[PDB]
Scaffold this active site. Structure first.
Site, short mmCIF file in Angstrom:
data_model
loop_
_atom_site.label_atom_id
_atom_site.label_comp_id
_atom_site.label_asym_id
_atom_site.label_seq_id
_atom_site.Cartn_x
_atom_site.Cartn_y
_atom_site.Cartn_z
CB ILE A 46 30.06 -3.56 11.86
CG1 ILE A 46 29.89 -3.79 13.37
CG2 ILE A 46 31.00 -2.41 11.51
CD1 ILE A 46 31.18 -4.02 14.14
N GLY A 47 26.79 -4.79 11.56
CA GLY A 47 26.08 -6.05 11.44
C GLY A 47 24.77 -6.03 12.21
CE1 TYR A 62 15.19 -11.44 21.47
CE2 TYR A 62 17.19 -12.72 21.75
CZ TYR A 62 15.81 -12.65 21.72
OH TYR A 62 15.06 -13.77 21.94
CB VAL A 122 27.18 -5.36 15.80
CG1 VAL A 122 28.60 -5.40 16.35
CG2 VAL A 122 26.38 -6.55 16.30
CG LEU A 126 38.59 -9.65 15.75
CD1 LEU A 126 37.79 -9.91 17.01
CD2 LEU A 126 39.27 -10.91 15.26
CG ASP A 186 25.17 -20.80 14.80
OD1 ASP A 186 24.92 -21.62 13.89
OD2 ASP A 186 24.78 -19.63 14.77
CE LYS A 217 25.85 -18.80 11.33
NZ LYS A 217 24.45 -18.90 10.88
N1 LIG Z 1 33.65 -8.27 17.36
C1 LIG Z 1 33.46 -7.65 16.19
O1 LIG Z 1 34.31 -6.90 15.71
C2 LIG Z 1 32.19 -7.89 15.44
C3 LIG Z 1 31.16 -8.62 16.02
C4 LIG Z 1 29.99 -8.89 15.33
C5 LIG Z 1 29.84 -8.42 14.04
I1 LIG Z 1 28.05 -8.86 13.00
C6 LIG Z 1 30.87 -7.70 13.43
C7 LIG Z 1 32.04 -7.45 14.13
#
Ligand SMILES: NC(=O)c1ccc(I)cc1
Ligand SMILES: NC(=O)c1ccc(I)cc1
EC number: 2.7.11.22
Lengths: 262, 302
Positions: free
Chosen positions: B14-15, B19, B22, B87, B131, B133
């Site tokens: 997802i991202g 380091y 996700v 989320l 940070d 944003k």
């Molecule tokens: N907590 C989350 O759902 C989440 C955290 C970081 C990213 I990049 C995407 C989703």
């Protein structure tokens, strides 16, 4: 103004008072330590004062480190040969949390005179993190001092540095200082410093803030007053040497008062 | 830390942070959808990264419905796994794809109010975010928005001491940081949130500078070049220069035209030059702008 966060300082003070009880070490852990003593701990802390000096670390960092050490030794039994390794890892963790520019691992390995290896320090870093469960944001004496400082009328740098100094002396001697919370040692430190330099006493305004009085501070204050009087004779001298420096206004050269008259 | 990797099934990437990566993942026993952030330590020759130490230690004690919840931390010898509440989206992605004719005023108001609640909680617990944003604000299906990514956050003392400079992604960075000021405080989070407010209304960054000095100039040209009257100290600041062009403050209704009087009022207070006069998150919650928000408060997480 905003640098003293008017809108949040009370919230923060209250939160720190709650977190200081959670992050408190066990008062009687050294008796349950088969192979280490108050005296060894004192040598360790003294050396961490020197390390802080060599690398020009924040005093906050030193205070965090001692907190990490005392909490660790509260649940983990440690051989004298490994005490320095715990201290080194604690100093690294404290540096990484509090310092803009933490010394590299290799510099921590360096100051232990290659007693330990890079891998030993790193493995110990993970053990402390696991033992503490990453509860690193602990209240310190200094966090309380700096807020108390805001009650000076007016600010007085000798007062500030002297209080910092007395609070530091307290880190050395687990007996009796383990029995007092940061907020109380800080109270005692602030009042002793205030009295020594200005003859003034713990302000009413801080009774309002803290709920502490000379009465509630009295035990701690008697210990801190002894520690101050004996400081030239203590086996450990690195804090005295440090507070001779003009950065701290040479406060370690001030004369302790012979009596508190209260 | 009762978690084990055996209990999660990874679902998709997802991202990606500094380091690691996700994944959206599913707890095979409870059903819970989480985000796993992996932080490889084998790669790290400097042991556990300071970013990760701050994120974990600080998120531990920040339990709030508008702060993303750290659920667990798994620590292998070679890997570290942060388990977070999941989320589905971030605010930047929501503005890009779905907010084409805009975010409705109700939803902007709701989001802003929740962001302020979250931020007030951080400051009340002596944490600067540093940070803020849209990329770092996560939104769910239920209408909640939560502060995320505490990798740049820090525990402050009172009064504050000198911390790391040039913090905060440039477009969201406060004047005092740009001017090299010796000390900064909670006011830097508010500035960011102010930039974010404008951004939710227009769907474009308010100050899209391409350098430190370009960022300043953009700010100056929008709010006027500050002097000793609007901001005592400004000209004594380390990177303040007398040669700075003197732009007149344009009328605030021109900065974000679609914005109402209440909106303009609150925005101006978030974007006040003097960090000492800038509104706190706590005070901003009572601003009239929010009078008609009714979205039920999000619930805490366990
Ligand atoms: N907590 C989350 O759902 C989440 C955290 C970081 C990213 I990049 C995407 C989703
Ligand atoms: N850093 C820069 O490029 C710059 C600095 C000061 C001025 I006046 C203009 C440009």
């Amino acid at each position: 103004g905003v640098n003293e966060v008017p809108d949040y300082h009370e919230d923060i003070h209250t939160y720190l008072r709650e977190m200081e009880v959670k992050c408190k070490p066990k008062v009687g852990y050294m008796k349950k330590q088969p192979d280490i003593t108050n005296s060894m701990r004192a040598i360790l802390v003294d050396w961490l004062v020197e390390v802080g000096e060599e690398y020009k670390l924040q005093n906050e960092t030193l205070h965090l480190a001692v907190n990490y050490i005392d909490r660790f030794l509260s649940s983990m039994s440690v051989l004298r040969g490994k005490l320095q390794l715990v201290g080194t890892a604690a100093m690294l963790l404290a540096s990484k949390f509090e310092e803009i520019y933490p010394p590299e691992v290799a510099e921590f390995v360096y100051i232990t005179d290659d007693t330990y290896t890079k891998k030993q320090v790193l493995r110990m870093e993970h053990l402390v993190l696991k033992v503490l469960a990453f509860d690193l944001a602990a209240p310190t004496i200094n966090q309380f001092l700096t807020q108390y400082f805001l009650h000076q009328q007016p600010a007085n740098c000798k007062v500030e540095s002297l209080a910092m100094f007395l609070g530091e002396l307290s880190l050395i001697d687990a007996d009796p200082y383990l029995k007092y919370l940061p907020s109380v040692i800080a109270a005692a430190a602030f009042h002793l410093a205030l009295y020594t330099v200005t003859g003034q006493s713990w302000p009413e305004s801080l009774v309002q803030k803290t709920g502490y009085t000379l009465e509630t501070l009295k035990p701690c204050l008697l210990d801190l007053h002894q520690t101050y009087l004996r400081a030239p004779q203590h086996a450990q001298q690195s804090i005295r040497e440090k507070y001779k420096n003009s950065k701290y206004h040479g406060v370690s050269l001030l004369n302790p008062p012979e009596t508190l008259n209260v | 830390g009762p978690g084990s990797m055996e209990n999660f099934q990874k679902v998709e990437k997802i991202g990606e942070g500094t380091y690691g990566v996700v994944y959206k993942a599913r707890n095979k026993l409870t059903g819970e959808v989480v985000a796993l952030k992996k932080i490889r330590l084998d790669t790290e020759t400097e042991g556990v990264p300071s970013t990760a130490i701050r994120e974990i230690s600080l998120l531990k004690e920040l339990n709030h419905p508008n702060i993303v919840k750290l659920l667990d931390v798994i620590h292998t010898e070679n890997k570290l796994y942060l388990v977070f509440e999941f989320l589905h989206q971030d605010l930047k992605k929501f503005m890009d794809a779905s907010a084409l004719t805009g975010i409705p005023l109700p939803l902007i108001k709701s989001y802003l109010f929740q962001l302020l609640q979250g931020l007030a909680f951080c400051h009340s617990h002596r944490v600067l975010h540093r940070d803020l944003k849209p990329q770092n604000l996560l939104i769910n299906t239920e209408g909640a928005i939560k502060l995320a990514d505490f990798g740049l956050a820090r525990a402050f003392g009172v009064p504050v001491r000198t911390y790391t400079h040039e913090v905060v992604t440039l477009w969201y960075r406060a004047p005092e940081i740009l001017l090299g000021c010796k000390y900064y405080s909670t006011a830097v989070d508010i500035w960011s949130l102010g930039c974010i407010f404008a951004e939710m209304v227009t769907r474009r960054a308010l100050f899209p500078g391409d350098s430190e000095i370009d960022q300043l100039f953009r700010i100056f040209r929008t709010l006027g070049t500050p002097d000793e009257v609007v901001w005592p100290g400004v000209t004594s600041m380390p990177d303040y220069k007398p040669s700075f062009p003197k732009w007149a403050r344009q009328d605030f209704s021109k900065v974000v035209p679609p914005l109402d009087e209440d909106g303009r009022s609150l925005l101006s207070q978030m974007l006040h030059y003097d960090p000492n006069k800038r509104i706190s998150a706590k005070a901003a919650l009572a601003h009239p702008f929010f009078q008609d928000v009714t979205k039920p408060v999000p619930h805490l997480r366990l």
